[PDB]
Amino acid sequence: KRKQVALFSSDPNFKRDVATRLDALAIYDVRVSETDDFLKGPPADTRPGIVILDLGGGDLLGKPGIVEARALWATVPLIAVSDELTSEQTRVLVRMNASDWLHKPLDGKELLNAVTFHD
After folding, report:
1. Beta strands 28-33; 3-8: pairing state
2. Which of 5, 35, 56, 107 has the fewest Cβ atoms within 10 Å of its own Cβ atom?
3. Which GO terms describe its biological process (predicted)?
């Protein structure tokens, strides 16, 4: 019934605030994990609806098989959250085919607009 949301972040403030915001909307089943858990792809016991990936400074974009790991998630919408990136990092982000590029600190409205657009 509820739309599964996989959230990946190494920022404790961001994890708490995004899970609280989406869980207050009641129509989302939100799972939270470390940024590098994204590389593992979806678990066989789940059915992802949306992925929220907190890239931070963009350390994960320099990981060798990152664009291939995105394909493990098939065509689920991907919401990318990051601080400012370089052109080289923006290239990887473009290949990762995210529907939204949110800049930290994200406002309430911007995240809810990105998630509800795919509903």
Report:
1. parallel
2. 107
3. negative regulation of cell division
